Design a binder for this molecule. Structure first.
Ligand SMILES: O=P(O)(O)OCCCc1c[nH]c2ccccc12
Ligand SMILES: O=P(O)(O)OCCCc1c[nH]c2ccccc12
Ligand SMILES: *Cc1c(COP(=O)(O)O)cnc(C)c1O
Ligand SMILES: *Cc1c(COP(=O)(O)O)cnc(C)c1O
Ligand code: NA
Ligand code: NA
Lengths: 392, 254, 392, 254
């Protein structure tokens, strides 16, 4: 039994070993309680404002759209403390862990942004943090690994399986199965077993709420579409949530097309995978014809989650949101364009969302449209990657 | 078929516990794995619990995680596992055979098709490690329609509602994960016979499980470690597996 | 003749070759005009808010001060777009360049933060930007150099002299002497010839104005002291300005002590240099007994300006502000402490200011005091530096 | 002393322009620099403009920047420069000697002390490159008290107020940086005789400056380049300096 619906249509659920169910039920109950607690809401709002820097700006990009009938705004999650939207939800989950009397945090991370965010939230809130990271990811993210250690977190390399994000995801679950009494598993995206998709969306929903108030203030109307990259689905569902009931607002999720969908080397399970059951949920997955889970490929390390949040699969199924893909080269071109024309270095993740907005604009330049791209993070971290590619 | 029912009736007539080893199919290769399984049976295994290698065995400890990797290194696929299962059943008609599965491999090409394939090759039960009772409906329904026993784990804590669900939903045997109260309550609710599992690695643990009221004990990591330890010597591997299983099974006898 | 006083007591002035005076007078006149122009003020406020992310948060640091009677807030310039306070003033100077009908920007940079800020402001505002950087600095700041190029700026290595910041400063002036008709020299700190010390302070003064409103809101009184690192003096004078007339508020500037004042390897000309005339102003300088200008040394690349803003020398002389120094090791310890206890990675520059606040707290733990440290920038850029040192 | 006044009177009696080379003291070494200066004089220099190496010559172009670096590489200090200046004056009693200074080197140990040292060694003028008329008061006052001519640059544009200030404030000569209107106005306001400078590198430029009404021409980069070009051959260096100065001075004659 649960207090909230674990499914979005056919997607979602709680596909975890029996031993983990009490942890999920405990978390769901604490969450429902926290959401009705004005004190919890005030403490969360306070950290978001005074520690993380909310609200984040909504920046109009006139130089990029000059000569077309597209008006483009960027929701500036790149200006959030930590440099990405991940910070919002780790602060809420950290407060939930404390609400449950937990003193420890367990987290998984691929590119390391979630590890960094979990570590910073744990440092601020006095939680003892341990992070699982696939050894291949550890190897290629030494900067993020060192930040986690400076912040007091223990980083544990995972060598099992492919030694990447999904393997770290399995190890986090394994750990929690036996330590949930004193540790909270701080899941990094709007995926996994209920109640995580729900919790993560609610702790990222201020992105869309602010965007709505900011766009109404600046344009006196809602956007024609809000566009966000989709790795696991948290920044996108955070931007989409408050607009779901505004039927006129398009919700466009952008998955990584990698070297191109036809190459098979991509990270677009929602539109090009097959529904499966893994990581505690039923959702579209990157998997072999046999049912073995595979990695997502993208020039962007952070769009590496091999599945997608169940609410996105659901919004897609009913036609409420549309999902598309953007290739590595398209994302790189958008990264370059934003740097040169607006002086903003976007994360390569976010660059996928920008790349799709640029296509909407460039393909029909005389189409009048008000677009908001969720700039989920800053791209300082991608400078070396982009440099080498350009050097190549 | 009623292989588990028949087994437990026979064991009860002999005031004997069941000793059930677990191995990963195809670890360290198909041929060696088939020899390992025949050795476990000849050595006294009463039933078998067999894992199909899966990419993300999030309910498995390091030892089994490594067995999955060895099987994958050998190219083992679920299809090959089902080929092995038919060969195993063809050689051993009465031993109960239970699969330890991950949900995706069951759901992949259709839940009902999966249990139909299990029935076709002669498997007796399926324990889907990542399907709690709350999500088990389609799985147990399909299992029951194909004469497959759906196995459920009764966790260490397990409140009363859970014990009642596990007793109602499962068949064949109840997997008792890591005591007397859990066992008495399972019996009270007419659950399938309990097989105790989780770290069983010595004969005294098998005798203690039987003394506690369990119908037997499952041992996997302890078995898989022997495979891991003797990879360079298949003959020594089989000799050590025989010795260990023989000892563990002896401990289950009255 | 000038409209505004070029001096702060004996310090300041316009010590430039005659050919550059018309450029300084033109700039001063445009500045005075802009400051009275409500439209210029609105355009500047708009970019600061919607593009740069102002206001920045004022974060209370309870974990750092636990057990003492010090209450410490950090003014979060690290959350400003670009990651440092430099962004504020480059946007104002870029708008001034446009007000004067200039289409090009010239800038100097040491550690590269100012180059990056000048480049981003130029990209946003459609100015053609060229940056001078000493070749030794180019060599050790390839990440910042590449960001400048991604943003469309031309980076020109300076090999003359010591091939560092002061040499780039000389080359920027040289260039401008002949191009001021169409190019604006975007000076990077509150130093150099009038009107720059004045302009830079006014375009950074929102730091202190916001801090004052935020601290009054949160504590109902002014701080006992505001503390800021002093490289050239811009972030410090930006924090200090609005408090100058609040006599009860201490103004503490922190210069880099490097390996220790007694070693001579430091960057504390205000308290340990000698007044000289260079870079267009009369001010305390790092110089030989002979009068040759020397480099400032600090573990922090950004506290490399070999002199200090004339207004700081003046505030020091009259006893209105107090200047102290913090060594490399003290700054590193503060960097570590903030990361571990608040989950904020501070710039090593800013870490000097934090290190001094920590000393004020630790030395007299039962002294009741409300302190604000200007966290002038984020420290992601210093992770490698700190790592190697710790590895060493 | 009145060396510039005497020089210009003599040149005027001969309807002749002044040719004034500039070199950096101590470039490429003290000994070679002293030979370079004697060669410039023997070759026909009417006056000398001499730079004291400074760490941050922000008013200097690349050629002179490099001369400063060579002098520093040789360990040249302002003190050594003043030692050279006394030796130069001791050998040449009437040639006007002007220093090209940066403000810090003048202000360093006291502005008045600096001009007192200039007077002691026999220097005739000082042009502080980074001191505009607006900040010149202490410098020109100290210069005048020690019988040193303070030299000011009249920039290409220079409005009327500036021409009037330069005419009133300067002595010795007016440095005319990069025309007839500037020259006529300087004469109208009774400014010190104008020496045209900035890129003068050929004889025709010297004759043109004199034709335009200037009292002479200053050439520095063109001279310094000859030093730069012949570093490996000091003898050839001096021969080429002699040839160039002789040509430039010939162009100034009626
Ligand atoms: O001896 P042990 O502790 O390794 O138990 C091995 C039991 C069979 C077994 C292997 N992998 C699993 C995942 C979930 C539940 C049971 C299993
Ligand atoms: O021949 P040119 O163009 O190098 O002029 C050389 C004039 C002497 C000279 C050398 N460095 C300076 C700085 C300011 C004003 C004049 C000078
Ligand atoms: C982690 C990351 C993402 C991908 O995760 P989502 O859960 O899909 O939002 C996107 N943008 C940035 C900058 C990230 O760090
Ligand atoms: C450049 C820099 C400074 C030093 O310059 P100031 O003009 O003294 O403020 C201080 N902090 C940061 C983060 C900087 O980038
Ligand atoms: Na994905
Ligand atoms: Na300084």
């Amino acid at each position: 039994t649960t207090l909230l619906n674990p499914y979005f249509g056919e997607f979602g659920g709680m596909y975890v070993p029996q031993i983990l169910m009490p942890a999920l039920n405990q978390l769901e109950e604490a969450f429902v309680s926290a959401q009705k607690d004005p004190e919890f809401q005030a403490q969360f709002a306070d950290l978001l404002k005074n520690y993380a820097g909310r609200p984040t700006a909504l920046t109009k990009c006139q130089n990029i759209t000059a000569g077309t009938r597209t008006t483009l705004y960027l929701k500036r999650e790149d200006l959030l403390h930590g440099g990405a939207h991940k910070t919002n939800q780790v602060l809420g989950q950290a407060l939930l862990a404390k609400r449950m009397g937990k003193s420890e945090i367990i987290a998984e991370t691929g590119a390391g942004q979630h590890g960094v965010a979990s570590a910073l939230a744990s440092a601020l809130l006095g939680l003892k943090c341990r992070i699982y990271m696939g050894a291949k990811d550890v190897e290629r993210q030494s900067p993020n690994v060192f930040r986690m250690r400076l912040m007091g977190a223990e980083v544990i390399p995972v060598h099992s399986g492919s030694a990447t994000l999904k393997d770290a995801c399995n190890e986090a679950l394994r750990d929690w199965s036996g330590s949930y009494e004193t540790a909270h598993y701080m899941l990094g995206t709007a995926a996994g077993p209920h109640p995580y998709p729900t919790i993560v969306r609610e702790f990222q929903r201020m992105i869309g709420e602010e965007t709505k108030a900011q766009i109404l203030d600046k344009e006196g109307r809602l956007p024609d579409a809000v566009i966000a990259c989709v790795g696991g689905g948290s920044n996108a569902i955070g931007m989409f949530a408050d607009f779901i009931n505004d039927t006129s607002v398009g919700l466009i999720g952008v998955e990584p097309g990698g070297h191109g969908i036809e190459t098979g080397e991509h990270g677009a399970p929602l539109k090009h995978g097959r529904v499966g059951i893994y990581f505690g949920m039923k959702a579209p997955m990157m998997q072999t014809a046999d049912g073995q889970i595979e990695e997502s490929y993208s020039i962007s390390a952070g769009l590496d989650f091999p599945s997608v949040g169940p609410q996105h699969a659901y919004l897609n199924s009913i036609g409420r949101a549309d999902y598309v893909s953007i290739t590595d080269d398209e994302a790189l071109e958008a990264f370059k364009t934003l740097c040169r024309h607006e002086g903003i270095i976007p994360a390569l993740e976010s660059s996928h969302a920008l790349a799709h907005a640029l296509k909407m604009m460039r393909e029909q330049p005389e189409k009048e449209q008000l677009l908001v791209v969720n700039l989920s993070g800053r791209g300082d971290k991608d400078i070396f990657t982009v440099h080498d590619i350009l050097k190549a | 078929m009623e292989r588990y029912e028949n087994l437990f009736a026979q064991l009860n007539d002999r005031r004997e516990g069941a000793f059930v080893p677990f191995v990963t199919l195809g670890d360290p290769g198909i041929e060696q794995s088939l020899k390992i399984i025949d050795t476990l049976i000849d050595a006294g295994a009463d039933a078998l619990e067999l894992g199909v290698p899966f990419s993300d065995p999030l309910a498995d400890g390091p030892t089994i995680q490594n067995a999955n990797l060895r099987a994958f290194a050998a190219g083992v696929t679920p299809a090959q596992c089902f080929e092995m299962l038919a060969i195993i059943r063809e050689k051993h008609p009465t031993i109960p055979i239970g699969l330890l599965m991950y949900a995706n491999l069951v759901f992949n090409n259709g839940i009902d098709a999966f249990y139909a394939r299990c029935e076709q090759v002669g498997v007796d039960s399926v324990l889907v490690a990542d399907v709690p009772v709350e999500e088990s409906a389609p799985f147990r329904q399909a299992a029951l329609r194909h004469n497959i026993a759906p196995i459920f784990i009764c966790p260490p804590n397990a409140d009363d509602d859970l014990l009642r669900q596990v007793a109602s939903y499962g068949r064949g045997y109840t997997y008792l994960l890591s005591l007397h109260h859990l066992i008495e309550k399972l019996k009270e609710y007419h659950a399938a016979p309990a097989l105790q599992g989780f770290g069983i690695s010595s004969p005294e643990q098998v005798s203690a499980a039987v003394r506690a009221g369990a119908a037997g004990a499952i041992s996997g990591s302890a078995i898989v470690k022997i495979i891991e330890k003797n990879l360079a010597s298949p003959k020594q591997m089989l000799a050590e597996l025989r010795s260990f299983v023989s000892a563990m099974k002896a401990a289950s006898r009255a």
